[PDB]
Copies of this chain bind each other. A is one copy, B any other.
Amino acid sequence: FVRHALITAGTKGLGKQVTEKLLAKGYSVTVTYHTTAMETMKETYKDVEERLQFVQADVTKKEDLHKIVEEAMSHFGKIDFLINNAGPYVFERKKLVDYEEDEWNEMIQGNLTAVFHLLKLVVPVMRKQNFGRIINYGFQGADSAPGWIYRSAFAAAKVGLVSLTKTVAYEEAEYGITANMVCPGDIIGEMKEATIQEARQLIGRSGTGEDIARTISFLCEDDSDMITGTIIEVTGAVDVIH
């Protein structure tokens, strides 16, 4: 009766701090990656190895998603928390009309359809448990369905994800399952993998992966069962999409 989390892309960026947060809480974790970074994580947590499982996976591929669920279930028997931390991002700034079909598809499959696929696998398990926490990621300002100049596909996929988070919240509330979204603001470079303490050492201090990690950790608690369908902005009042 130790709760189990499944987190996509949890060895780098924001997802690394999320993983470290849940382990620190006593949770067991399945972490996906898409390899030297994973190996250093595995080594850092040598002494708690039974509570940490690594699986290689491309979240745009249905089969790989089926396999991370199968491997989590095989070793742990349960999935209590699904953190859809993985979010393929086209860093290039260009207009929708200039998008390659490969880029469009990567955004949609990577950010919206990957979540559908996962849910299709994980919701039934959560129903059997009468417990589930789904955490999706948005971007700042997401709940207002905004356009994002030069981020067409990403924004479209994530805004669509907003709708989906909400629908899943209403459809699965019956079964002890909550679905929420966290929106990180502009957390840049080294600060993605950094702690609050570190940012505070140097508007104000930079936002960090820990800021996200502590918000996700709060939504995953047993007594957060009434918080569902909500979008938590963790941006420190710093505008991104404008």
A235 within 8 A of B: yes
A37 to chain B, nearest CB (A): 24
Q: A170 to B148, alpha carbons, bound, how many Å?
A: 8
Quick one: CB contact mask for A178-215 with B, threshold 8 Å, 1 for yes?
Answer: 00000001000000000010000001110110110011
CB of A224 to closest CB in B, whole Å: 8
Residues of chain B contacted by A164 (CB below 8 angstroms):
96, 147, 152, 155-156
B-contacting residues, A134-154, CB 8 Å: 141-153
**Do the beta carbons of B147 and A145 come within 8 Å of each other?**
no
A172 within 8 A of B: yes
Minimum Cβ distance to chain B for residue A69 (Å): 13
Tell me, yes or no, whether A99 is within 8 Å of chain B by CB: yes
Question: B144, B148, B172, B210: which contacts A146 (Cβ < 8 A)?
Answer: B144
Identify whether the interface residues of A are mostly helix, strand, loop, or mixed: helix
Interface assignment of A239: CB less than 8 Å from any CB of chain B: yes
Partner of A167, one of B104, B147, B172: B147
Tell whether A162 is near chain B: CB-to-CB under 8 Å: yes
Question: B218–A229 contact, CB under 8 A?
Answer: no
User: Which residue of B150, B155, B224, B229 contacts A237 across the interface (Cβ within 8 Å)?
Assistant: B229
Interface string of A98-115 (1 = CB under 8 A from B): 010100110010001100
Given that A159-B163, A230-B232 are known contacts, is A147 also in contact with B174, CB under 8 Å in the complex?
A: no
CA distance A101 to B113 in the complex (A): 9
Least Cβ distance of A167 to chain B in Å? 4
Q: Which residues of B contact A120 (CB under 8 A)?
A: 96-97, 99, 101
A176 at the interface (CB under 8 A from B): yes
Q: Does A226 contact B (CB under 8 A)?
A: yes
> A97-B119, A146-B163 known; 13 other A-B pairs, CB under 8 Å?
A96-B116, A97-B171, A141-B144, A144-B144, A147-B167, A147-B169, A159-B159, A169-B237, A174-B204, A214-B224, A227-B232, A228-B237, A229-B237
Provide 8 A-B residue pairs closer than 8 Å at the C-beta atoms, listed in order of the A residue. Answer: A112-B160, A145-B163, A152-B164, A156-B160, A169-B237, A173-B203, A228-B236, A229-B235
